[PDB]
Amino acid sequence: WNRKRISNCVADYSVLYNLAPFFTFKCYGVSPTKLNDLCFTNVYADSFV
């Protein structure tokens, strides 16, 4: 459960939408198509295989 912390960032999601290796965008509680308009306090990432 190695969790990566995102605090000081400009979260540009054009990487997430304009690159080839992406399959599913299963978002709960928020729409993925409007993620570039909001702001967040702290973002946490769990990146496993």
Binding site: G29, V30, S31, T33, K34, D37, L38
Partner: protein, 49 residues
């Protein structure tokens, strides 16, 4: 009592706007910002009702 009932009903009507009525948020703009038009309308129909 005539003064107090008319004050109390208005206070209840004001305080009822913080209720969610089963929606995700009682704030009107947050549902519009966090969701697209497919489910924002069905989430805000509960608030309007």
């Amino acid at each position: 009592d005539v003064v107090n009932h008319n004050a109390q009903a208005l206070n209840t009507l004001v305080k009822q706007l913080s209720s969610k009525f089963g929606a995700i948020s009682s704030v009107l703009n947050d549902i519009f910002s966090r969701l697209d038009k497919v489910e924002a309308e069905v989430q805000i129909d509960r608030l309007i009702t």
